[model samples]
Target: EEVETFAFQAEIAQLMSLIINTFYSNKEIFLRELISNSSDALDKIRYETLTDPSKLDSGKELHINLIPNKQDRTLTIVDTGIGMTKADLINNLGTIAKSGTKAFMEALQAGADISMIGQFGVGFYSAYLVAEKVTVITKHNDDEQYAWESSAGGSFTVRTDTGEPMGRGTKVILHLKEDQTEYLEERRIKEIVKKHSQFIGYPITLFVEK
Candidate 1:
């Protein structure tokens, strides 16, 4: 919800329909995978805390905010640490489509200081297991807020955000498909958080439905 959304919802329905029908076996792994990636983002910022401590001026608190807004059919995962740049949005989610995370990890493992989760690269795209469209709102200390979105295919679009500025983190909105109603339940979301990400580094919360 950090950014005002743009149009182009027509093809999304047809595009996402194929993804949900074709690949939807282990949908539960989506949240944990996302959280895992969030953890790694916090990790990167910590590394910078020593080298570039000034970036932490924004309060580098590491936490993930999971909110399920059924009315909008959007599940948002928000973070409180390092955000992303325009290039980051392209490389991570745009260029590679699925294993983009995997390649990012590989580059990190090559003697670089950046170590990321969602390494298998399937984490981000795993959202398609239940979502019709995936929207990422990110703002790093490096760049202004930007939104990235994709359907089931290898293509995605990126644009400068015209909405409220995110303090310093990334926000993800999963527009769940029509048949994926089980994900809209708060109880089920809590259970999923407990089962997969409860023991992790941050708090998993449900945004109070207004």
Candidate 2:
């Protein structure tokens, strides 16, 4: 099988359960967390281009697009920034099994401020707070595009993207939970962006159907 499934780093598995059950009260934070991630990616590409102008040859403007699909019950956050290769997906997302997760979990239990969670490098897992499943398709200049999918249940899978090719960046599709369809609303998305990520350096746009 071309699809490879990877177990969450042991600590990450525990982190997922904590996020879904404990942070559900502030589930909307998922959007802010994702936007922060996209901004980080955009920052990286820009910094890389300072040394190698050819990095800008991808020709895609740096921005983030939020596309909500009511019929599909999915909210996709697309970003034209530094994307991940297959190995990057595995290592970055999978992470090392024996590492700093313990300290991160300790901080959470100490009632550390939720806003500080991003400092632990686990903000991406916040998506599990609102999504039943998440899919990430990313293209890096040094490698072909790849897809990563997970339900945050136990493990995740990654494979080559054989469908429509993206320009150069990452597309994160969140399959919202059954009762979490509020994210599909344009007004709600705009409100959340305004509230949490209005000051992000890169543009954050919502795609609306006419």
Candidate 3:
């Protein structure tokens, strides 16, 4: 299949600019946001499995893994969660201010202000705070794997994922910016996680290479 490209919805372009260009007090919150999104995806799958056990990936662990590669200058967050179909990717990532987790909460009849950190729908773009480019490789039980890539540019592209096959989940790869190398530091990553996301319900493991 040919790769399909789509412009960031009107609001996302502006929102991306704000997140990438303007200064933010705490750029590390990008890690928090990514974790939250994974948690939500896990929650979704957990809920669905309640009614239909088959949707569950029998023995797969439900957790988040953070991998920082100093040599490659990249940080990857991997989650064994609900993952996303093509349409879900377009709707959730391509648009700004309309969050998938928020919509899920509404449909689930839960309060929006609760624990889901992706309520603002701008959390994912926060990756731009430290990354020059971001690539999301995801696989949903209902659809084949796909890759979504953008540089906080005005547009994003989606195509069949060319990497190793995933059973079910998402992997967000951040190509860290030159000056943002601090994120790849093991101590810095651990400190940020302990400070901001300690309360997250799921287990978060940061893999450090020796």
Using TM-score, give the best candidate's number: 2
Query: Global CA lDDT of candidate 3, please?
Result: 0.82
- What C-alpha lDDT values do all the predictions have? 0.70, 0.85, 0.82
lDDT of 3 by residue, 124-201 (tens): 877888898999999999999999999876999999987899889999999999999999999999999998788877
* Pairs with steric clashes in candidate 3: none
Q: What value does the lDDT take at residue 130 in candidate 3?
A: 83
Clashing pairs in 1: none
* Candidate 2 residue-wise lDDT, 1-210, digit = tens: 498889987788888878777744777888988999899889988889999988978845999999999999999999989998888888877874334567788997898755556667777888887898999999988899999999887799999999689878899999999989999999899999999899899988899956
Worst 10 residues of 2 by lDDT: 93-102
Model 1 scores worst on lDDT over the 10 consecutive residues at 3-12
| Candidate 1 local lDDT, 1-210, one digit each (tens) | 443233323333332343356543657777888887787787777778888878788775778888888888888898876888987777666444445444544454474322132554545656787787888889888788898987755456788887778778888898988977677788888888888787776666677666
lDDT of candidate 1 at residue 54, scale 0 to 100: 87
Assess every candidate by TM-score.
Answer: 0.77, 0.93, 0.87
Report residue 120 deviation for candidate 2 (angstroms): 1.7
What candidate 1 gets wrong by more than 4 Å, as runs, is: 1-23, 97-119
TM-score for model 3? 0.87
